[PDB]
Design a binder for this molecule. Structure first.
Ligand code: HEM
Ligand code: HEM
Ligand code: HEM
Ligand code: HEM
Ligand SMILES: [Mg+2]
Lengths: 306, 305, 306, 305, 306, 306
């Protein structure tokens, strides 16, 4: 093997998502930070073992990749593709670097973020900063259990990590982020039965709706895709609520990892553009994307060796 | 008689501080919410037992008190007094209601805050909202253990709850809030030994500096008051770090409860204005107050009506 | 002076309810056991400190009281009063002794029950034995949060413990038990909104329905009683699910403690017999009582001194 | 080739459900089997990572033949009755086994509910046992139960079908027996005597040395070596159960192995005895009232229907 | 009350017992430390709350009391009395100060002990230091559950704290310590039934032997003493195993608190000297006392103010 | 194939290190115990699942190897080599057997140590016995976080276990032990800044000093070693504080596992003998080694077959 980053992390209940762009002349400061980021993860986290579960995953955008490195590029790396649907729009916003920081406690996330941004002061410009918190029974902002169908164990390794198909970058992965804001008033206006039809599962028991009854414009319907293999195509998600009550913001921060962006991008097309039999994913009638960025999260050794 | 609000809460690691002003004509919506706030605390919290440790303490400002109620006022209740020191200034900022929401997990805090602000949409205007997190070994944003000398058990009851001296409002308390922002670059410029001289305790072990060596302008020096009888005057604090890395904000949200504001106010005068033998509290050379508000947190039964 | 039994126990996640009758000639064996029950609680429980939270509360029925003791009777003690409603019937079934055993683990409950029934074989006849468990996030078999409005701290002391009004028995309490079996098929036939109208609170969030909307034949409506005082009358409940999937039994084991049975019994009248404006508690359309018994749970010192 | 969760962590609660398939039920059963994996997730996922909910599904000999056609697991047959001179191991009906385990009973019960929900109509319950860990992994005879089970790779190799039956690799063979103990009789023995029945020390759980351990002790008769001299091992997860009302005290026995030959050798030695032992002394205080054998297929066999 | 020291501590699983004598001239250093010991307890412990449960109880001997303070003496304070029995001897060994430090983790105990001995370097001479650990189910070194019959709640307050009978020192208590070493080879030579006869309870289940079968020279027999009222006299114990495998030392560190030493001393006479009906406590045939000291543990305010 | 001993343990907060020598004639008794030591680990530890985390690692010295075993020797096994530096000295002390016993509680360690020494009483002579405890945030006796840079997962498998380079003993490891006693007075005389320069990392935050500020005589500097390969050479440490406040002993018990002793021995030469640009490791100016032994810890299978 090479060591991948902590893409397959345990259940964690807090996160910080940090997206930044690299200023003019920043490339050197950044390259230094990248070579140390693994050891900052350990500095902050080691002393909080073992309940801490602190991990930071670092990702790099398509344009940033070319400023920072020469040598070949990961096969799949490109700017996030805007999707201008008949009704709904998946936007593209700027981002050169992603830090996806996760732990059991927000303060650990904050301490690591402090250390990282400390080393980058001068060189970067923050584009997004989100402090996320999982609800107490793995629920998201819509009140549904979120994560149930994520792959685990060897299936997750298979779905998420670059392998032999791009051997130079094996152990890497492709992360897509989108920040969503929900219209909770609208959403709470539906009966539970109606909400279950939007999602495709039971609210309370989290059991899948039977095929004979699950709508084709339900979220679970549109994000189940079968490959040429006959194999189901899987991504790894770690959606996190965030918000502010004073400013009436209630959000879900989407992040999905896959071994090639083609998978993540297909699901997005289905959601925003629709299919043969579905105008668009009903979940977008209550959720607006306000960011969109795609990153490559290299193998851990790649970063070590600079 | 009285059940007080959850002023003496267990150690909790997350908080939301929500400060609002009441719009014109809002008084009725507010009065309804106050009668229900206890049962929202239970709705949201009960099912997360026993890890949850969700509590909300509700406080009311001096001007708001007059809008909402007639009858007596709590004897100590007045607007926060600005302190214009030689060097440092304690500001006074607007606030009619305080919700001091605490739990072991932030999401519980957020769920209760959602429900409360849900019932108040229309009637109020948010002034401040802070999501706080205690660092993993009870440390604050300056890296010091924060809370060590708070009173506990019976001493805390004695220090924090209104009693026979204002018997109409026994079970209540007086909360003072100040939001502080720190100059971290400045602070991290000091050696540990120097920082210990600012605070008055050892950084790593949290042992008090001995009397013979503790500076008189150290924080612990200026916030130790004895009353007339020689007995120490205590408050109960629950300071919480908060911040944002992107915008370089690193903060401590101060809240102190006391059975009369006279105590909290004296410590503040000493800090901002100085004494005989100290220009001001050295901690203010790294910490700037950008809010200041005083609230009365009534006994729980008072709100039930 | 007087030390009550562990009526105000912490949240515990397992229970055994044991109801027995005293055979002819059994009175002596029983009286010995009552003086020892506290020390068996310690024997079993002490070694599993402090996670264990094992408590046994012992209660005695009205006719059994006369067989066991002469001297004064607790003022409120009588046989459970059958309620023959127009539609629903609260039955009264035999029971001389109650052991309400609670802990964080079932095995501790079982161990204590073993020791107690060990000393009593010969003298008693088991009438009911239920092994109960917490569901999830304090939910009951109907899927609602169960316990939310129980009194706590000082208010609970005030509501549950006999005081100056019967000074001989101060520290005691009155327990009523009813075993309920639910018609789950029927219940799952309702929409959530319909179920919420039966109970009087929201299913998922456990927020009370406003007066503006709460039905008068909702369960929360009928079990809220105000005294002549204008003050609410409260009891302390510790309902436990129990069940068997093979026999389709899904149950709620109801137990309510109060300082006088008049309170518990009023709530029951309202539920079974109805009011001005409500035929009966809608919850009984999905719940059948198959036992009913009333006991006095003396102060702990009362039992010691035998 | 992924197996079912036969190697579970230590879990403190179990439900064992044994059912028979009614005539005409075969379709409803085959549908459920393809979904049982996704119900495990639906119910269990939200209680992670304490939950440790796992369901292992097994199929009986006759039922196999009603549900599927083509080739059979090499070792799958009806449980073989044992008519010893003193003790008898009976065979009872059972077409399907759900071995449901978690850190809490309610997760077990919730999954059992959803499964039987989908099968109401097609099947008839034969046995339903709610098991609990006692204290410190002790059983109803008061001895530590589990100590010599294989772990890690030794357990993979002892319990999963491999190259010797390639079509069914990933599978295992579960034998179940419900045992009731005569506790009165058992508590009549001194501890030293009880230790001679089991073959280990009661309080410390150290093995008796070979020069003192009886040949009719349980640990003696269930230690079996192969012709190659290596130990033949199974994986057990015995659960106490009972009812104090009915003076029923039980150990529900479940033993997984890569071939039933191993499990069946141990049973023959227990019930029928050896050269130098009439029968396992533990059977003088334990009566078997069920007996069933099931094959627990690889996970992908059930998914793909 | 005035505020007592933490005599009534929860179950904790580690302890350090530190016994020292005061050197000539040391009186001043000691008086300073006593006024600060409360705040050292908080310094060390606060940051590990609430898992920590660090408590230190400070006690002062008879002769030391006279060197340190003028004013009245606690009524019960005197040197531990050697008991020279026909067979077994309870020795008396020197000690001016006792620190009984307890927590859930040894390191917290050690940190506080380091701080205390740090301030006393110069002034004192260590006599005894034991690091104790609870065996995993509250068992002691002989394999029996140890602590079961200790009083709790109000009964414990009543049994251990000085009240109106010596009003000047209300909130105080009297601690006796004895370090015992066991003859494990001998002990393991007995059957369990024989050991149960030594102690007076069942080994595994921790149930008391019935009166009609419990020997009069069993430990539980000789340490059960009834006052004039017929009511039991109780102490509060927190025995801790300690040992060293290399040197074959297996020990029990005995500590008992009582509101008057007369109770603790009665139990000791019965154990060591015997009664009309018991030669001596059979436990002493497997246990040798190698220390013996008596201390007064004042109310916490007493230490605060000087 | 082969199963190693529990070299890679979880984080554990208690340990007993027991070093013994085999007396003449003891070799049979010792061979017996080695074949059972695996099953005593389970006897003691099984019932304390899953919190217990009891593990025993057994190591054998060079000379003992020769007395105990039939055929060939681990390639790297020799006597610990004394290091006679110009200022500091790494001594070599007797030790044939090592038991490295770890768990989440000291009592489990003690119970296993008891059972082991039980079987060996007669055949061996104790040289060293240390009861270690982790400070509450992975700190050592100098107040620095200790453990931070240890390897994890596959990196640790690679750096610690013998493989195909000595195939008869693959699954084994090489342990070096050294008991160090610190001069706390001296050490606490330094400012924190000075202490950080001795170690090479920050005291409070545990972040590494940047390369242009990190002294070459700092501990972290001298124990960072690259191989001829350009790769960093790693060991796995589990240093445990220990001590006695009475006797002013404050200690760090050093144990380092590696797949060859060459690595551990290189770091020691650098520490005690110095480099191009450093006299010796500054940490030795506050730490004195009083033991030194090297052992080989065979695969689990090796011991079972005896
Ligand atoms: C806008 C906010 C979003 C929310 C609140 C959300 C929520 C959920 C929920 C509640 C489920 C069902 C339970 C589960 O299996 O996790 C789910 C499933 C899923 N979501 Fe989303 N989701 C969101 C956006 C997205 C996006 C943008 C994608 C893909 C780009 C995605 C991909 C999936 C997939 C692949 C599944 C499961 C498919 C399967 O069941 O086989 N989600 N999501
Ligand atoms: C500016 C941000 C603040 C920070 C970061 C802070 C931090 C601390 C710290 C680290 C301690 C030592 C540990 C403890 O005993 O809690 C302390 C003690 C204390 N602080 Fe503050 N503090 C702040 C503001 C205030 C204010 C405004 C007041 C009063 C109005 C106050 C009152 C006290 C008191 C009374 C003590 C203890 C007195 C005694 O030691 O007996 N603090 N504070
Ligand atoms: C009837 C109730 C049973 C009880 C209470 C019981 C209890 C125990 C206990 C206490 C041990 C020693 C500790 C351990 O290794 O787990 C043990 C070992 C064992 N039992 Fe049982 N058992 C029962 C039935 C069975 C049956 C039916 C079988 C096999 C078909 C069996 C197979 C084993 C095996 C293979 C061992 C370990 C052998 C070794 O030490 O190398 N048990 N059992
Ligand atoms: C080696 C020393 C000792 C050991 C190992 C030991 C052990 C025990 C054990 C196992 C029990 C039974 C469980 C319990 O209720 O705690 C017990 C009870 C008791 N022990 Fe000890 N003990 C020792 C010394 C003492 C001493 C020196 C005293 C008194 C001065 C004492 C006083 C008691 C009392 C008062 C009881 C319970 C009385 C009642 O049973 O109602 N112990 N001890
Ligand atoms: Mg019987």
């Amino acid at each position: 093997e090479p060591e991948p980053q902590m893409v397959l992390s345990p259940l964690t209940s807090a996160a910080i998502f940090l997206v930044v762009t690299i200023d003019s002349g920043g490339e050197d400061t950044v390259r230094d930070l990248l070579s140390d980021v693994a050891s900052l993860e350990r500095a902050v986290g080691f002393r909080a073992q073992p309940d801490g579960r602190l991990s930071c995953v670092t990702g790099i955008g398509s344009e940033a990749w070319d400023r920072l490195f020469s040598g070949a590029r990961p096969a799949g790396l490109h700017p996030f593709r805007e999707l201008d649907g008949p009704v709904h729009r998946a936007v593209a916003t700027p981002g050169d670097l992603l830090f996806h920081i996760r732990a059991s406690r927000l303060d650990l996330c904050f301490a690591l973020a402090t250390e990282i941004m400390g080393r980058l002061r001068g060189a970067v410009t923050p584009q997004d900063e989100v402090h996320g918190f999982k609800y107490f029974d793995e629920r998201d902002m819509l009140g549904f259990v979120d994560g149930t169908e994520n792959p685990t164990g060897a299936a997750a390794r298979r779905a998420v990590l670059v392998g032999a198909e791009d051997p130079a970058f094996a152990g890497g992965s492709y992360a897509v982020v989108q920040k969503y804001l929900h219209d909770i008033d609208a959403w709470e206006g539906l009966s539970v039965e109606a909400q279950e039809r939007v999602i495709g599962r039971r609210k309370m028991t989290d059991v899948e709706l039977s095929d004979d009854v699950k709508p084709a414009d339900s979220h679970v319907a549109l994000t189940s895709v079968t490959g040429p293999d006959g194999s189901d195509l899987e991504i790894l998600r770690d959606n996190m609520p965030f918000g502010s009550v004073g400013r009436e913001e209630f959000g879900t921060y989407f992040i999905g990892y896959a071994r090639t962006p083609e998978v993540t991008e297909t699901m997005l097309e289905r959601m925003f553009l629709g299919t043969a039999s579905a105008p668009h994913d009903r979940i977008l009638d209550f959720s607006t994307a306000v960011t969109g960025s795609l990153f490559f999260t290299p193998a851990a050794d790649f970063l070590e060796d600079l």
